[PDB]
Structures are given as C-alpha cells and as structure tokens.
Amino acid sequence: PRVSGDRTIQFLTDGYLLPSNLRKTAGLEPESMCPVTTKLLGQDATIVRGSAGIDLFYDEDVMQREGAMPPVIGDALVGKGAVHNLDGEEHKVRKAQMAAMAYEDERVAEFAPLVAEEVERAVAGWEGAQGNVFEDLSLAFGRAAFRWAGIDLPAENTDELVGRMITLLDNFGTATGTPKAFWQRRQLDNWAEALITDVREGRITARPDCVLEHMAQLTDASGERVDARTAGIELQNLTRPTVAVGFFASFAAVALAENPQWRTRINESETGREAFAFAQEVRRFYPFVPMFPAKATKDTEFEGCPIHQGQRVILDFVGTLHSAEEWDNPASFDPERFMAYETQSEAETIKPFIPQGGADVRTGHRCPGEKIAVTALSAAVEALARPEVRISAEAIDINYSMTEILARPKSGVRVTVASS
Numbered sequence: 001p002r003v004s005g006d007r008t009i010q011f012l013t014d015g016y017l018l019p020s021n022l023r024k025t026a027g028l029e030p031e032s033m034c035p036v037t038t039k040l041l042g043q044d045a046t047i048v049r050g051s052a053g054i055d056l057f058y059d060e061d062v063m064q065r066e067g068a069m070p071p072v073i074g075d076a077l078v079g080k081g082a083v084h085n086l087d088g089e090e091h092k093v094r095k096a097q098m099a100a101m102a103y104e105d106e107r108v109a110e111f112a113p114l115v116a117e118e119v120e121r122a123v124a125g126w127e128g129a130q131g132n133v134f135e136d137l138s139l140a141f142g143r144a145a146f147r148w149a150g151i152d153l154p155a156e157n158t159d160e161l162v163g164r165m166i167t168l169l170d171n172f173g174t175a176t177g178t179p180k181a182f183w184q185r186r187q188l189d190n191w192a193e194a195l196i197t198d199v200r201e202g203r204i205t206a207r208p209d210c211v212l213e214h215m216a217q218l219t220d221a222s223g224e225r226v227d228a229r230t231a232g233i234e235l236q237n238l239t240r241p242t243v244a245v246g247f248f249a250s251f252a253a254v255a256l257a258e259n260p261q262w263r264t265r266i267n268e269s270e271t272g273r274e275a276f277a278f279a280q281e282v283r284r285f286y287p288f289v290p291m292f293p294a295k296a297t298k299d300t301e302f303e304g305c306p307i308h309q310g311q312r313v314i315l316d317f318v319g320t321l322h323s324a325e326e327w328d329n330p331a332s333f334d335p336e337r338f339m340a341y342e343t344q345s346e347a348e349t350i351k352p353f354i355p356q357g358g359a360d361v362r363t364g365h366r367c368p369g370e371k372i373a374v375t376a377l378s379a380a381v382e383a384l385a386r387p388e389v390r391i392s393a394e395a396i397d398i399n400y401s402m403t404e405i406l407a408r409p410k411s412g413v414r415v416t417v418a419s420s
Ligand code: HEM
Pocket: 083, 084, 085, 095, 098, 102, 237, 238, 239, 241, 242, 244, 245, 246, 248, 288, 289, 292, 355, 356, 357, 358, 364, 365, 366, 367, 368, 369, 370, 372, 373
C-alpha cells in the first residue's frame, strides 16, 4: 500500500489525522494493520501501528534514531545532541544516566510530595479568581521539576525559565510558532550550559546526589565528560517534559467535566486507584504524541512490505492507542480499563499502551519519565476533581483541534475555585 507523491506538507496540514488519512487514501479498510508507505522529506516513510508495528520500531538490530526526527522539530524540542538522537552503546550509556534520575522509584517518590505541593498552590490561586489549567498546572509542574532536580534559583527566575519551556512546548509544532520555539531553545540552552559550567567550576554547589549534580557529571561511553551545553540540554530533557504534562492535565480537566460520575468516584475514594486509572485513560485517549520516527539501518521487510536502508519507519501512536484490534471500544473514554492496575510499572505490561513509547525503558528509547508523568497527572486529577473546582464548559474550553501539534483546548481550560 503506497500513497503517491511527497506528502511532507500534508503532515503539517493534517496533524494527528495524517496516519488515518493516508491509510484511507491507500485504500486500506478501517482498522487495518497493514503498513502504508509514503514520501516524507525526500525519502520513503512507512507508517505502522499496533503490536507488530511496535516490535519492528523498537528492534534496534534494524532501526536507528540518528537523523530520523526532522531537525526543525528535534533541535527545538529536545536540543542538538540529545539522547533521542543516539544509537548503540553511546545511547545505552546516556540513557542509563538519565533513567537513573527519572525512572528510579526512590527518585519518583521524591517528586511526589513536591508536585502535590505545587499543584495545591496553583489551585489555591484559583480561589475566587480566574485560573487556567494549562498555564497554571504547567507552571506548577515546572516548579516541582526544578525543585526536584536540585535547580535552586529565586522564585522569579524559576518561573521565567519554566515560562520559556511552556512557550517552546506550545509553539514547536507549527509554521508560525517554530521561530518562537527556536528562540526559547537558544535562551534555555545558554542558561543550562552556564548552570552546568558553574557547577563544574565550583561557582555553584549542587545538592549531593541531585539530578543537577548527575547531569554535571554526565559522561560518555569512553569515560569522558559530555560537553557542558549537551549536559545542559539533558538537564532540560529531565525537566521540560514534566512541564509538558500540562497538556495531559488540560485534557484531564476536560475529561472530568465530561465524566462527572468518575469525578464523584475520585472524590469519594481513599485509595487513589480511581484517580490513577483516570490519569492513565487520559494518556490513552487524548492526542499528545501523533507518531514517532526511526530509520532503517539495513534493508529488511515488514509484513510483505520492503523496508529500504535509510528510509523512515513511523510508529503511529494515535492509531495504536485507538486501534480496535488492540482495545475494546477504543473510542470510549473508560477508566475501568485500568482499574485492575496498581502502578505505572504494572501498566508497562500492556503492549499497545504506548503514549510515551513502547518496549523497554532501559534497553530502548522508551520514555523514562512515565512514572514522573503519571505521578504529576494523578496529583492534577485529584485536585481538579474536587467539587469546589468549577471547570468551564464553553466550546473554547472543551474542544480541541486534531490538525495542530501539540493539541489542547484553545483556551487552556478556564477554571475557578468556589470560595466563601
Ligand atoms: C508529558 C508527558 C510525556 C510524554 C507524552 C512523553 C513522550 C515521550 C516519547 C514519545 C518519547 C520517545 C520514545 C521513543 O523514542 O521511542 C520520549 C522520550 C523521552 N522522554 Fe518522555 N514524555 C513525557 C514525559 C517525560 C518526563 C516526565 C521525562 C523525564 C523527566 C521524560 C524524558 C524523556 C527522555 C529522556 C526521553 C528520551 C529517551 C530515549 O530516547 O532513550 N519524558 N518521551
């Protein structure tokens, strides 16, 4: 199944609709698990979804990541030289040092009280006032992330830097926004490089064993220290993605307005299980990652389709999270599908549940921040569900576009907290 012509522009105009549009244009039936091949940026690109597509995408014998992401996205979103671009042993060594910070249960347990504290502070600012879920909880997450990482700055400096990360996250994916994203990337990179260099030269003392200290000590596979700008880029890769949970927190507010019986179950629970399952179904249901790219390292073959060395393989995330072959009633928002699960570690066993990637965190490229993200999103869900929180139901607060990346309600979701 091919679609003719170069569809680079159609990737921009369709956003999250691109993979299902191309499958339709190729003549596949709805719910087909057949690959579809198009041309993107001058080369073939084969879009796959579902469990067999996950296995291909994460097979590092045949897939590499270097060069797979277009730099206009990647250089702005993750920075040059980031772990996302690395392959083989250099990737393994870099990923081990970053997963040691984000994915270890002891460090996640350090983050939990910080994000609960910052979320409660944001929600307190809504009392009798006009709040914004996306802007205010993204800022709360960023404040928690900076304190968690040991980035110790005056309050106004932290807020300004988190503000830059929000502006970057809110703009990297459109033609109008990309110069704004690249400007923020340069300022943030300059800031993080100077902070890393300050720690390495003794001008700033990091808390022992904190994330900032471990990023200043970042080394490569030969044993040499990674240059200071790249280490600052990796420090951002352990704080900016936490700010980005604000997108999921916006959707969670929409979902609580739309599911009042689940909201009641959360408010009446003492276990946290409903809020956890609700947070997971927000990540399953709502669009965040549209798709993700890799490049073939050698000629191979997937379900009768030839894969040429150098071409892209694109894992369709929306189509995997919404596949009728992988999920019962995938168009239904239904937290019951996660109610039997207790932790994010247990949720990893669900093979098509890949909102932040698939396969294994330490041996592959899968996101090492899912425990952090579910912790932050769960804290948001619990606070948003409380009955004094009044979530606006107007069309600009509740609806969101599927043709723009990243997606969120246009208003950010307006909220207020009832006060006497
Ligand atoms: C806001 C929710 C988040 C989403 C939707 C998200 C999504 C993703 C995705 C799709 C990937 C790529 C997986 C792959 O290459 O196969 C990724 C990688 C990564 N994420 Fe996340 N992420 C989130 C939160 C976080 C958090 C909280 C952290 C850490 C604090 C984090 C750090 C990373 C890192 C370091 C990588 C690169 C891993 C690698 O290439 O080996 N992310 N993320």
